[PDB]
Amino acid sequence: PDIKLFGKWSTDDVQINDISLQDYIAVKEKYAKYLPHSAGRYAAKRFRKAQCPIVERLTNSMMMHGRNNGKKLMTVRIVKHAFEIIHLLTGENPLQVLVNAIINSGPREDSTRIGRAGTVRRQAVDVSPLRRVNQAIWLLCTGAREAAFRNIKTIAECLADELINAAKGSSNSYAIKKKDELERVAKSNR
Amino acid sequence: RRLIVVLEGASLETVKVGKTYELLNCDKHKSILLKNGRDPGEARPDITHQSLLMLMDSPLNRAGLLQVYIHTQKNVLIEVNPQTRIPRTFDRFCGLMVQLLHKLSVRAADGPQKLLKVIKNPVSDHFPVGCMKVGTSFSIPVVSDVRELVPSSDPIVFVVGAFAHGKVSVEYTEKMVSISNYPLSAALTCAKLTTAFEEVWGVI
Amino acid sequence: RRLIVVLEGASLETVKVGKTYELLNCDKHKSILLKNGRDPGEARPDITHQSLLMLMDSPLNRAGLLQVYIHTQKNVLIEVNPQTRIPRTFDRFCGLMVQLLHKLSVRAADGPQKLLKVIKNPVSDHFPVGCMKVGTSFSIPVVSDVRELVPSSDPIVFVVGAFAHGKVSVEYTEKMVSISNYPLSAALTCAKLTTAFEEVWGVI
Amino acid sequence: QLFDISGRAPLRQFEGHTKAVHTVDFTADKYHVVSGADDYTVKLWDIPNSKEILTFKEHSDYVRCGCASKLNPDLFITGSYDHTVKMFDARTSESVLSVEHGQPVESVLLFPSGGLLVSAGGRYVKVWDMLKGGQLLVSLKNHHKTVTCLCLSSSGQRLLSGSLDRKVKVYSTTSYKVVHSFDYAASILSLALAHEDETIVVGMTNG
Amino acid sequence: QPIKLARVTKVLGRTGSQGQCTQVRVEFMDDTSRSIIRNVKGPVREGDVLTLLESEREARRL
Amino acid sequence: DILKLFNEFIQLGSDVELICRCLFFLLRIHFGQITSNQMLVPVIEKLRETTISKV
RNA sequence: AGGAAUUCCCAGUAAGUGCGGGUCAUAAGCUUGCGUUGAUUAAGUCCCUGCCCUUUACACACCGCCCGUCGC
Ligand SMILES: Nc1ncnc2c1ncn2[C@@H]1O[C@H](CSCC[C@H](N)C(=O)O)[C@@H](O)[C@H]1O
Ligand SMILES: Nc1ncnc2c1ncn2[C@@H]1O[C@H](CSCC[C@H](N)C(=O)O)[C@@H](O)[C@H]1O
Ligand SMILES: [Mg+2]
Ligand SMILES: [Mg+2]
């Protein structure tokens, strides 16, 4: 049998174009699940949350933002609606869209600060792949939340357009702006 | 597209003499400044006052493309509504801050909208994300043309110090520029930053 | 070639309260001003304050390329030296004005050279030969670009109203122009006027 | 405005046109739209990108009727009240074919197989072939008022035309002769056919 | 300057002085058999792959 | 440079063990890079003769 | 939708929700149990603020003397 997310999105066609992030995005055949709700212990040990599927991580990180915490089913349906809207608008596999968005949104180098009372200075430093994934997911969720606030537009459409723009690589998205400015500051502090 | 102006190091603080509360001025409060070993010549609300008059009456604010932030010396951030009408004369101006600094907000008399509001630090959180952040100072040897630095369709942040002496130094700015070969006041600095912007953005 | 600006309708006068001599300020003198039924709000000395600060601090003036004249409502004509420093604080500004009207002039603190002195009416006599006069106001339907009105090597006289309400109208002005479609302050009109003439004459 | 059939607010809004817009349709691929408005211009938009791909300005009156070919996304036809039906098609910056009609063109329809274009103006209904450009194969009038709309049945042979005279005419494409008539109470502004001939819907002058 | 890829061979320790970043030894995925020392922000273990915009800068230099 | 300086230290015969322990650690960690560079060929030839001879 | 400053917090933990009891003290707009839903980041250094100790079981291997003052 073939395991398809929500019964209709396959995972075999999904491919990752970044060799560095191959080991930290769990979307392939072993990590394929029917629903993003598995009730595992992925925060028990260091580096174990790399085994949690990326859709479940997106569901968890969408619960923290702009919501009373502990409501997971609402977030699952929000993710389902966002995937449906993405498929309707773009016509391709939403899993590939999400993977491309996470690949594009992740910063490559950051700036470590040495700070005193008077002034702060920086040095450009490398970023580990796990922090790349964490910041990508966090930026996408925060951008969707900020776009959805005080607007006649439900969170699902804002999340869908955020993933669409990030996967396209357009600068109209929040995460791309944040990533570009972080790399620009890191370049300036070399 | 918009211009963000942040007034760094504004000398806005409240002191009490007798039974009355009024903002701390170098001249009216000369005796109490000498008390407690405070150096005279930093209580200058006028620098913020003259600088504010230039921004709020500028054509860019008239067209609705100017937003002004004030960061005082006591690390208090104030948001300036473009629809606010600032006092032109010095005395009633100080009443606004005494109204603002204790009550933390100022409501419009003829409108439900707030006009002045104190918000959470740091100021870097409230800028549109991805905006360019540039400061103004004489310490730069190279004189830069303001028109060349203006973005076509993006917001940009310009920081002007509100002190007669000292150097602007905040964490979020990425470059330091000078735009004249002569030392000029903060108020005129407000003028030359804004007056270049309308002509690029087609406001005449 | 040199820019000459005359402040017409300036509200500068000294009144007697108690035994001391004080400048006639609107806010300070509400009790006195209401008596005799002359209109409150007309006495607006501060308009002269920031106007001088913008003009004197402009790079053109420290270049030696600016002349400022004051023609008050009480028909007093005042010269100002380019080396004069105008106080930033308003009451120190009102301090110097008081000694002008009574002592007719003021010497520098470190030299006999004249910084302020009241001269004889009219202002037209002291104008240099071959100079044409232009008036500035908002009411003109057509807006004039200031870059077009600058002469290459001819001195120039402009009039800016330092009064509260009304319109400038003097005999020696030959033409009347507008610089923007918005109601502007005299300080900003002085601000824009000094800004445009700066780049044309090679001052940066 | 793009709308979801289960939502409440538009998913995408396009701001390019300046005056009222009256015709809009998809393409052969389901991700671009072609629109025509009263500002004499016809614009092609991309749905996911949320921007206008291309524009055309080659008409002199109100543009209120348009159709897009199902076979090819590139090929589509635009008609107007300027008496000209210009086909904006292929991948270029100008009309490749144009057609002249003697009355303002109320509606245009593209017959799927064989490249036949049917145009309605006034009483006249005119059929044009694309094997030879601008060839009027047959012009027919069976109405005593202006012809409003033209529809195609599920079968290729049957064709329907509705007008302002409470009367709908059914023709065979092979013979180009009327084979049936329908009579109604008010002038038929809209005529719609379901799968096969299951449901016939006619929308009138009144509510 | 083309984008470079590196593999983490040995994890040295936490700087302390330079924030809390980790010094790691990285060897380039090219068949040049080079190895340098870099500063990494965030959790990193042996076997990780890093993306370098600049392959010339060294962590410990005069 | 340090490989050249180490060659002088072994030849003098003073503090051989500390230099040898230091020398063998550099060779292993940079084994891949040292082979590629042709400029280092003369240095290793001098190091090869000196190291075994002194030990 | 609550400034300046300041307090607390690492896994069924933070946060939301309901349902009981009043138990020889404490508890009434309070106090304590029970269950349901359940997260983001971190698994390491002495850089700041500090705390606790030390500087006299001879396998192999490694290593090879902390300093100063005043009293008797
Ligand atoms: N030529 C110039 N270009 C840009 N900013 C200027 C300027 N001259 C003065 N300023 C700004 O105006 C403010 C007050 S002028 C204060 C002088 C101070 N030595 C200084 O230059 O920093 C300062 O904060 C300064 O940043
Ligand atoms: N748009 C404008 N262009 C040129 N001068 C202006 C101006 N707006 C105001 N001024 C000058 O500024 C002074 C004060 S404004 C005085 C009020 C008058 N209704 C007016 O709008 O001008 C006047 O003396 C006037 O000459
Ligand atoms: Mg709160
Ligand atoms: Mg409870």
mmCIF file of C-alpha atoms in Angstrom, chain C residues 38-182:
data_model
loop_
_atom_site.group_PDB
_atom_site.id
_atom_site.type_symbol
_atom_site.label_atom_id
_atom_site.label_comp_id
_atom_site.label_asym_id
_atom_site.label_seq_id
_atom_site.Cartn_x
_atom_site.Cartn_y
_atom_site.Cartn_z
ATOM 1 C CA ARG C 38 -6.398 94.863 21.107
ATOM 2 C CA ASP C 39 -6.631 91.402 19.638
ATOM 3 C CA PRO C 40 -4.858 88.468 21.334
ATOM 4 C CA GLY C 41 -2.859 86.136 19.088
ATOM 5 C CA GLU C 42 -1.418 88.904 16.904
ATOM 6 C CA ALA C 43 1.696 89.202 19.093
ATOM 7 C CA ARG C 44 3.593 86.134 17.846
ATOM 8 C CA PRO C 45 7.325 86.785 18.343
ATOM 9 C CA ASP C 46 8.295 83.098 18.103
ATOM 10 C CA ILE C 47 7.752 83.126 14.327
ATOM 11 C CA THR C 48 10.834 85.347 14.189
ATOM 12 C CA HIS C 49 12.653 82.950 16.547
ATOM 13 C CA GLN C 50 12.738 79.741 14.497
ATOM 14 C CA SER C 51 12.944 81.733 11.251
ATOM 15 C CA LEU C 52 16.254 83.279 12.320
ATOM 16 C CA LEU C 53 17.496 79.894 13.547
ATOM 17 C CA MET C 54 16.811 78.281 10.176
ATOM 18 C CA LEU C 55 18.254 81.216 8.208
ATOM 19 C CA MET C 56 21.360 81.892 10.293
ATOM 20 C CA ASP C 57 22.260 78.201 10.617
ATOM 21 C CA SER C 58 21.912 77.553 6.877
ATOM 22 C CA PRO C 59 25.185 76.670 5.085
ATOM 23 C CA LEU C 60 24.693 79.650 2.763
ATOM 24 C CA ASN C 61 24.961 82.120 5.655
ATOM 25 C CA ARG C 62 28.151 80.655 7.127
ATOM 26 C CA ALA C 63 29.440 80.792 3.549
ATOM 27 C CA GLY C 64 28.903 84.546 3.793
ATOM 28 C CA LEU C 65 26.167 84.351 1.158
ATOM 29 C CA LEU C 66 23.055 85.376 3.138
ATOM 30 C CA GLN C 67 21.500 88.632 4.316
ATOM 31 C CA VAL C 68 18.510 88.789 6.646
ATOM 32 C CA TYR C 69 16.455 91.893 7.375
ATOM 33 C CA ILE C 70 13.664 92.437 9.890
ATOM 34 C CA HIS C 71 10.801 94.856 9.296
ATOM 35 C CA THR C 72 8.510 94.746 12.304
ATOM 36 C CA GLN C 73 4.861 95.749 12.537
ATOM 37 C CA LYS C 74 5.857 98.932 14.392
ATOM 38 C CA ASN C 75 7.942 99.959 11.341
ATOM 39 C CA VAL C 76 11.408 99.227 12.795
ATOM 40 C CA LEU C 77 14.101 98.118 10.336
ATOM 41 C CA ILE C 78 16.800 95.857 11.770
ATOM 42 C CA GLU C 79 20.106 94.670 10.308
ATOM 43 C CA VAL C 80 21.795 91.456 11.409
ATOM 44 C CA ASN C 81 25.457 90.547 11.065
ATOM 45 C CA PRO C 82 26.185 87.131 9.489
ATOM 46 C CA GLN C 83 28.515 86.421 12.427
ATOM 47 C CA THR C 84 25.613 86.826 14.875
ATOM 48 C CA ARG C 85 24.563 83.718 16.805
ATOM 49 C CA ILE C 86 20.831 83.554 17.568
ATOM 50 C CA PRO C 87 19.979 81.897 20.915
ATOM 51 C CA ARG C 88 18.253 78.535 20.639
ATOM 52 C CA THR C 89 16.162 79.153 23.773
ATOM 53 C CA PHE C 90 13.215 81.509 23.423
ATOM 54 C CA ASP C 91 13.613 83.605 26.584
ATOM 55 C CA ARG C 92 17.317 84.215 25.931
ATOM 56 C CA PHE C 93 16.096 85.288 22.490
ATOM 57 C CA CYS C 94 13.624 87.670 24.149
ATOM 58 C CA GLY C 95 16.517 88.871 26.294
ATOM 59 C CA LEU C 96 18.506 90.177 23.338
ATOM 60 C CA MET C 97 15.492 91.770 21.612
ATOM 61 C CA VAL C 98 14.728 93.900 24.690
ATOM 62 C CA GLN C 99 18.180 95.504 24.699
ATOM 63 C CA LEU C 100 17.964 96.269 20.970
ATOM 64 C CA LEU C 101 14.874 98.471 21.127
ATOM 65 C CA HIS C 102 16.132 100.644 23.990
ATOM 66 C CA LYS C 103 19.898 100.720 23.314
ATOM 67 C CA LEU C 104 19.314 100.933 19.497
ATOM 68 C CA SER C 105 22.099 98.376 18.890
ATOM 69 C CA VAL C 106 24.323 95.771 20.562
ATOM 70 C CA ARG C 107 28.086 95.208 20.401
ATOM 71 C CA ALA C 108 29.747 91.825 20.348
ATOM 72 C CA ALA C 109 30.879 90.457 23.696
ATOM 73 C CA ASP C 110 34.465 90.030 22.463
ATOM 74 C CA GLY C 111 34.702 93.004 20.130
ATOM 75 C CA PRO C 112 33.306 96.397 19.161
ATOM 76 C CA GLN C 113 32.014 95.022 15.845
ATOM 77 C CA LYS C 114 28.264 95.451 15.392
ATOM 78 C CA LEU C 115 26.012 92.377 15.440
ATOM 79 C CA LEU C 116 22.593 94.121 15.602
ATOM 80 C CA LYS C 117 21.668 97.726 14.808
ATOM 81 C CA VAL C 118 18.400 99.440 13.862
ATOM 82 C CA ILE C 119 18.721 101.562 10.726
ATOM 83 C CA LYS C 120 16.601 104.159 8.943
ATOM 84 C CA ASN C 121 13.472 103.467 6.872
ATOM 85 C CA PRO C 122 13.065 102.411 4.045
ATOM 86 C CA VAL C 123 14.813 99.118 3.339
ATOM 87 C CA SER C 124 14.793 99.854 -0.409
ATOM 88 C CA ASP C 125 17.576 102.440 -0.128
ATOM 89 C CA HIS C 126 20.168 99.996 1.254
ATOM 90 C CA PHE C 127 19.493 97.440 -1.495
ATOM 91 C CA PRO C 128 22.370 96.955 -3.964
ATOM 92 C CA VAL C 129 22.101 98.360 -7.469
ATOM 93 C CA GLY C 130 20.668 96.126 -10.183
ATOM 94 C CA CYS C 131 18.575 93.977 -7.843
ATOM 95 C CA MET C 132 15.005 92.850 -8.504
ATOM 96 C CA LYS C 133 12.498 92.050 -5.756
ATOM 97 C CA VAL C 134 10.195 89.013 -5.535
ATOM 98 C CA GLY C 135 7.370 88.327 -3.082
ATOM 99 C CA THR C 136 6.335 84.976 -1.608
ATOM 100 C CA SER C 137 2.826 83.863 -0.616
ATOM 101 C CA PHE C 138 0.515 80.851 -0.814
ATOM 102 C CA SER C 139 -2.444 82.613 -2.461
ATOM 103 C CA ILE C 140 -0.828 82.646 -5.927
ATOM 104 C CA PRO C 141 -2.616 80.070 -8.138
ATOM 105 C CA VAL C 142 0.578 79.136 -10.014
ATOM 106 C CA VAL C 143 3.433 77.438 -8.158
ATOM 107 C CA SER C 144 6.942 78.598 -9.056
ATOM 108 C CA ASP C 145 9.904 76.226 -8.996
ATOM 109 C CA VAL C 146 12.563 77.977 -6.914
ATOM 110 C CA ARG C 147 15.366 76.608 -9.106
ATOM 111 C CA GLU C 148 14.167 78.803 -11.990
ATOM 112 C CA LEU C 149 14.139 82.112 -10.083
ATOM 113 C CA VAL C 150 17.816 82.090 -9.044
ATOM 114 C CA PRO C 151 20.095 84.544 -10.883
ATOM 115 C CA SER C 152 23.571 83.334 -11.782
ATOM 116 C CA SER C 153 25.637 86.304 -10.543
ATOM 117 C CA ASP C 154 23.045 88.884 -9.388
ATOM 118 C CA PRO C 155 22.093 89.615 -5.762
ATOM 119 C CA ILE C 156 18.463 88.912 -4.981
ATOM 120 C CA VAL C 157 15.875 90.195 -2.490
ATOM 121 C CA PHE C 158 13.018 88.017 -1.221
ATOM 122 C CA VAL C 159 10.256 88.908 1.260
ATOM 123 C CA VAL C 160 8.883 86.413 3.794
ATOM 124 C CA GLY C 161 6.037 87.356 6.109
ATOM 125 C CA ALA C 162 6.829 87.078 9.822
ATOM 126 C CA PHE C 163 3.295 88.113 10.834
ATOM 127 C CA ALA C 164 0.441 85.928 12.040
ATOM 128 C CA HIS C 165 -2.411 86.395 9.541
ATOM 129 C CA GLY C 166 -2.799 88.346 6.308
ATOM 130 C CA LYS C 167 -0.739 88.677 3.143
ATOM 131 C CA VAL C 168 2.528 90.423 2.297
ATOM 132 C CA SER C 169 2.111 93.638 0.298
ATOM 133 C CA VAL C 170 4.965 96.152 -0.004
ATOM 134 C CA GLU C 171 5.660 98.760 -2.662
ATOM 135 C CA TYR C 172 9.153 97.783 -3.820
ATOM 136 C CA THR C 173 8.359 94.155 -4.689
ATOM 137 C CA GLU C 174 8.030 93.705 -8.445
ATOM 138 C CA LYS C 175 6.479 90.225 -8.634
ATOM 139 C CA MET C 176 4.714 87.715 -6.402
ATOM 140 C CA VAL C 177 5.303 83.944 -6.438
ATOM 141 C CA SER C 178 4.222 80.741 -4.708
ATOM 142 C CA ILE C 179 6.518 77.806 -3.924
ATOM 143 C CA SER C 180 3.997 75.091 -3.003
ATOM 144 C CA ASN C 181 0.296 74.241 -3.036
ATOM 145 C CA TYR C 182 0.152 73.742 0.764
#
